[PDB]
Design a protein around this ligand. Structure first.
Ligand SMILES: CN(C)c1ccc(/C=C/C(=O)SCCNC(=O)CCNC(=O)[C@H](O)C(C)(C)COP(=O)(O)OP(=O)(O)OC[C@H]2O[C@@H](n3cnc4c(N)ncnc43)[C@H](O)[C@@H]2OP(=O)(O)O)cc1
Ligand SMILES: CN(C)c1ccc(/C=C/C(=O)SCCNC(=O)CCNC(=O)[C@H](O)C(C)(C)COP(=O)(O)OP(=O)(O)OC[C@H]2O[C@@H](n3cnc4c(N)ncnc43)[C@H](O)[C@@H]2OP(=O)(O)O)cc1
Ligand SMILES: CN(C)c1ccc(/C=C/C(=O)SCCNC(=O)CCNC(=O)[C@H](O)C(C)(C)COP(=O)(O)OP(=O)(O)OC[C@H]2O[C@@H](n3cnc4c(N)ncnc43)[C@H](O)[C@@H]2OP(=O)(O)O)cc1
Ligand SMILES: CN(C)c1ccc(/C=C/C(=O)SCCNC(=O)CCNC(=O)[C@H](O)C(C)(C)COP(=O)(O)OP(=O)(O)OC[C@H]2O[C@@H](n3cnc4c(N)ncnc43)[C@H](O)[C@@H]2OP(=O)(O)O)cc1
Ligand SMILES: CN(C)c1ccc(/C=C/C(=O)SCCNC(=O)CCNC(=O)[C@H](O)C(C)(C)COP(=O)(O)OP(=O)(O)OC[C@H]2O[C@@H](n3cnc4c(N)ncnc43)[C@H](O)[C@@H]2OP(=O)(O)O)cc1
Ligand SMILES: CN(C)c1ccc(/C=C/C(=O)SCCNC(=O)CCNC(=O)[C@H](O)C(C)(C)COP(=O)(O)OP(=O)(O)OC[C@H]2O[C@@H](n3cnc4c(N)ncnc43)[C@H](O)[C@@H]2OP(=O)(O)O)cc1
Lengths: 258, 258, 258, 258, 258, 258
């Protein structure tokens, strides 16, 4: 890999860590980088030892956005071509949980990439923003959708129309991120979180993740019916039986992913 | 009742109070408890003197969830028998406002029961969580739906996939609960809130509640049209004439629930 | 104008400022006031020099609601004649960004008017509320819809069913408003915000605003597809090319709004 | 029962037949009739021998609507009493399939009752209509919703705004009913259909019914995701194994309902 | 009017007739024509004597679409900040029922105009189609939305992607139109239909129309709740009292429109 | 290719033909067959000479469903494995139009495959059905969703719950298919249809197809707004001008796919 670095972490290497490694362009997400990222994601998704994935960048930047230089001379017809900014949402197809550990800059595509993850942990100095408007364009990877649904209309409108950045504290207060940690312990805290998740049944975890994601795709009435079906279906797994036995039997549960 | 204690309270016994009373199992919501709860709710719903209902538990626990021992040996087929965990959402059918006064633990079904209520007040030491994942199952009573819609994706994912609990402070900050009070004044503050509601027209209050609930069942454009129709319909009541006349006449309004 | 005061305050006269000026009724929004407001909005919308609009009231009150005296003797039939409280949502049709600078009271229709704007800035002493329930009626201009989607069910239910007001601090914490400023610098800070927006391409800004508003009208999956189409379409403008080229050339760039 | 006749005219006694029996008022559905209908439905729903239910009326009329005499002296407040025209949609909660065998008149509430069923068979002389408009009211049991979704806007608008009736032929052509039979063989044909359904696994049939109903409650994208989950869940039943094995073994399948 | 003809044609002037009169361009809907159309619509909407509106064109053409010559040189820019092809959906805002009497050609904007109406009657020689694709563009006034919802995906796709026209018979079979009449009696039959509608309460009719239109804006569950609220609200009118009484009194009803 | 046969059949070789060729199992769609089908689809999608794709099978069968023998011994966990009946909806991702030419049997997965296509042409002897229920399972590839939306609740429920087949005539009347042709000329008529489509601008056609598909993914109000944005965007293409000038200049259309 020329733009990313990967390694297994956790107690039993149950955690997959992906680090964007293109320091020069503040981790600008060029087409090649996305290519590798999707590869890394796929390998971890296929590895039956990995139960969760952690995504992070540098200390100064998570990602400053997509590569502006690569899209400077593209056309409207270039957009309906199919080779312009494709595969950006492959991460939304990963069944396993993905935690974004954000230190420093998370702008444009960078902020959008973090929002595509299931959980976001931010470093004390992290900064989020959607500056697309300053470049004469608008967010094109969920910046007007995921952001608005987490932060509320007023703050989303202010961010998208002005291009202003918000601090990690503001992001936590608004619900964009769920935890803030010191710059130097961020990635570690993220890994510990991934570890807790990796310890649970992989099949049950995948169902829970689907259920939560469904909250943004249907009415509450139907969302609850779907959730109920998923709940019922867990009763067809062995881990559910094992899990509830471990409780009454007041012992630790040992899930075997099925 | 064996598992609950009821009693009218407030200004004119206009507030119905229901207290989960099964101390030994940290208020675990077994089938029998749910049975009584729905009875209590129905009586208060039918009592024309009661304008609001307050739901609370013990000081150490609101409810630690459904009874794990009652579902430990059930099956997938049992889920479709229609005899497994039935009648849990009867509370969502109550027309009158219901306030949850949460002290201590509010886990799994407990947290979900609180979220089914219209308003939530938490004690300084309250704790919310969805630990279903630790038992090899997922939330099955709105934990992946109502939670996500209030708290945002990141925190909802973190809570549901790890099983970690959050404090009352975190819950208020995230919008899960609207007010925090000292452990010993919680139930009273809740009752005072129920009292303000009980003082308003019961027919107008029921319409307002429906309108707010509709916010999670349709697009904003349609939600506004529905709200408009409801607003128009209030002009067919006497209390609306009495209320707007009491303002211009600089006097107290006397609603006749008509 | 007999109820409003207008003027262009931009540093380059690019911000349209509208001030509700009916001090005696705490800016109660009577039919005549709404008439002028829509006129003011339309003129600024048509003025190619104005890129953003700021809406504010007095120091003691933004607006205490619609005029109660004008609706106290209306009937149900009156409502369906389409000549009662009509034209209240013309502001939602304005394509240019609208910032609400709220000082003091913002109740009922006043709170709803603020929520119709794209961004809300509140003064340290601002107060929001939906006291309709106290008059024997319910919010009829989005108070049960926009409020709930920004603040969460619990707080929305509490506000709408009790009629209690919330402070500016609470509003910011809940996500109702995005910034709090001292009473005397509020309008100025709002204007500065409008200025930043006015500096961006008007055509790109209009698209960004549409995309954000779409977040409340469709599922996330479709919202993202819509956003993508809008993003593609920006590649058919000159300001986009000028905006990206300006970046790689380390030079500022101003758009000709096309 | 004074208004209905129930008898297991099924063959293996697996089909429950309910016949509206109030000849004098052309089967006008008064409160007492609905009362019994819901009872009959519940008993069959609980009877493990019954796999499907057939609903029919007289030869001249299925049902001429709700009892007009019973609602002539009601008021707006009455509607919000919580119980005026209640329990009119209990049939939509029955998990087993329900076939409506419609002979003669099916007007207003009668037409709506038929549309609430899963399948509709009409006699050659059947007539459908929503004459509510002629009584100075509108359909209030799905007549503007289920009708429109089956028949299309133009025909639904014409039917609802004029009150005109349509023939069985028109109903089949528009998709309101799926089959037309001679007046004297209608009920039998309906029973034969119920029989085919009753022969399949009750648990699988219940899932299939839910999936089809979901088509009117969510987007196609989510509808397909839900359907997929239900499909997967069938693999946790025994009947699904028996059913596919019976095909490969080229023999008849014996479903045990689990 | 330059390209329009209007006249009250009811037996009491209860029916407003609008006839597109631009023979030379096969009734091509140019900007000027749309202007007058919206005026005509508004006058009839305001006339308390008119209860329904009938819209028709010539015998050879209803409308061949929007004026192709008027949009030939316009560009992307013209589309955003433009009154370009504006006010085309004013007809969807009319509260009173609108019947489209279609003889001959109804293509592109013409077909779309017809679908915007509540009811469509077609002459034996009427032809519908969306040939936009042949001009290198797509339907932009509901041709891919209303058509699909009435006719089904297969026929809508075939019509939109090939540009092929369908006959009146095909349109009736598919549910696009609800009635076919001889070329000479079409307009007359349409007027008779408008008459039946005009005889009913104008306020109840407007509610029924809203309810039916809601069927395409929300889930079935919410659609039914909305319809129920509208039904309830009819009990606050006098005409509902009159209508139901006239039935029990076995006598004709006289609606006062309130 | 071991199970299919691909061919270029346009008048300019602009039509891609794919023929399922596994006669022995009545074209049962086994995993290998789906593999090739997706390959064939991808090649045609990438070939800039092909403007439309035609999908057909044998004269006796289009496809009898997925391979029952390949799923006979699979588990619930096999479903959540990640690769059981995978890649079945790749066809819904193809941007180019796809016509299904159905002769003979089109059951289960076969019927669902046909419904995934944009247009369906059926031979006089074609038969459609969803017999999954007879195998102790339910439709899992859109059979309860796409079928219901095209055919209506009654017929969809009857088909899915009984397993009964319907004729080509019934399918056309219900809107499932848009045209019926003699068994011998079916594929040829389908190709002619594909040809007409292939003659139009590829980029405009792709947009029209997206707009029609959006009709099942959002409310009518939003669907129309989306359509309008797509319509506007066509004004940024050359084919739009070429097409609109070709009409005004009374000459034949000149397309260049951009
Ligand atoms: C699937 N679909 C449809 C889609 C998917 C994705 C997207 C995404 C779009 C975007 O992200 S638009 C980009 C939004 N981001 C931005 O506007 C941020 C631009 N960056 C900045 O303003 C600043 O670099 C900054 C991050 C605030 C840090 O400033 P500072 O500390 O002064 O560093 P600075 O010298 O500017 O940056 C260092 C190097 O990184 C480069 N760089 C920064 N951001 C970059 C980016 N987004 N792309 C490429 N290079 C970038 C700089 O140009 C510079 O390289 P050289 O000039 O040495 O060649 C769209 C559609
Ligand atoms: C309608 N549909 C479809 C649906 C509707 C509802 C549901 C709901 C599901 C759930 O709620 S699953 C339950 C969620 N709860 C959990 O996962 C674990 C809950 N409990 C705990 O984590 C811990 O007990 C704790 C609340 C932190 C307190 O711990 P600690 O302070 O050490 O006390 P501890 O001794 O453990 O608990 C005291 C007693 O309460 C019992 N208990 C606690 N939680 C219980 C529960 N959820 N069910 C039954 N018993 C419970 C303990 O077993 C113990 O009783 P003995 O064994 O001594 O007889 C699903 C579907
Ligand atoms: C499109 N559609 C369908 C729709 C569109 C819009 C709407 C909106 C409805 C509403 O807003 S209902 C109204 C919501 N607002 C309220 O209920 C606020 C009522 N006001 C108050 O509680 C208090 O006035 C207050 C704002 C807390 C300020 O108290 P305080 O400082 O003591 O002043 P106070 O003396 O009460 O009021 C000063 C003057 O303002 C007037 N005023 C205050 N609010 C008013 C209002 N909403 N309307 C008319 N006058 C009002 C008072 O009557 C008084 O005038 P005088 O007759 O005494 O000369 C509905 C439907
Ligand atoms: C859950 N929620 C909120 C809701 C739930 C449900 C509903 C439902 C509302 C409706 O159904 S409104 C009613 C819609 N139905 C109608 O308009 C049908 C009215 N009936 C007719 O037009 C005619 O009776 C007819 C069905 C065409 C048959 O005519 P014909 O053959 O001459 O019979 P006719 O003598 O008129 O009627 C026979 C007897 O049945 C009675 N009847 C007929 N329909 C009736 C009805 N809907 N209600 C009560 N009685 C009815 C007649 O009054 C008469 O009784 P007597 O006068 O001899 O005492 C609303 C809301
Ligand atoms: C709110 N927004 C954003 C939006 C709102 C609306 C729209 C709507 C767009 C469209 O409707 S696009 C237009 C769709 N129409 C078409 O593609 C062409 C339809 N017409 C034809 O192909 C043919 O006229 C025909 C109806 C098949 C038969 O006509 P035929 O009998 O052969 O005679 P023909 O000479 O062609 O037409 C007679 C005269 O009407 C004119 N004409 C016909 N259709 C016309 C049209 N759509 N616009 C302007 N002129 C038209 C012809 O140019 C001719 O005038 P002369 O040059 O001879 O003086 C879009 C967006
Ligand atoms: C993405 N995801 C999650 C998903 C994606 C897809 C699916 C789809 C599921 C299905 O389609 S379930 C299957 C639905 N189809 C059926 O049930 C049709 C079953 N077939 C039949 O009833 C009959 O074969 C028939 C097509 C009506 C006519 O057949 P007939 O003329 O009597 O001849 P018959 O001997 O039965 O069939 C000829 C040969 O084809 C085989 N065959 C027919 N249909 C088959 C099928 N669906 N699978 C495998 N083999 C099949 C037969 O077994 C036989 O082979 P031998 O036994 O002689 O070795 C699910 C989920």
């Amino acid at each position: 890999f020329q733009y990313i670095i990967t390694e297994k972490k956790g107690k039993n290497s149950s955690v997959g860590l992906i680090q964007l490694n293109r320091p020069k362009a503040l981790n600008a997400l060029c087409n090649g980088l996305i290519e590798e990222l999707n590869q890394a994601l796929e390998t971890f998704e296929e590895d039956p030892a990995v139960g969760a994935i952690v995504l992070t960048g540098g200390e100064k930047a998570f990602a400053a956005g997509a590569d502006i230089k690569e899209m400077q001379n593209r056309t409207f017809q270039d957009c309906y071509s199919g080779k312009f900014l494709s595969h950006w949402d492959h991460i939304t197809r990963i069944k396993k949980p993905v935690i974004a550990a954000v230190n420093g800059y998370a702008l444009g595509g960078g902020c959008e990439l973090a929002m595509m993850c299931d959980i976001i942990y931010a470093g004390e100095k992290a900064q989020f923003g959607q500056p697309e408007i300053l470049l004469g364009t608008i967010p094109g990877a969920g910046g007007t959708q995921r952001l608005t649904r987490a932060v509320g209309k007023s703050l989303a409108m202010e961010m998208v129309l002005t291009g202003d950045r918000i601090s990690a504290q503001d992001a936590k207060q608004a619900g964009l991120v769920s935890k803030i940690f010191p710059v130097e312990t961020l990635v570690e805290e993220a890994i510990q979180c991934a570890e807790k998740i990796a310890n649970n049944s992989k099949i049950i975890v995948a169902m829970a993740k689907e259920s939560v994601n469904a909250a943004f795709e249907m009415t509450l009435t139907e969302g609850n019916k779907l959730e109920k079906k998923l709940f019922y279906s867990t009763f067809a797994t062995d881990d559910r039986r094992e899990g509830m036995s471990a409780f009454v039997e007041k012992r630790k549960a040992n899930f075997k992913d099925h």
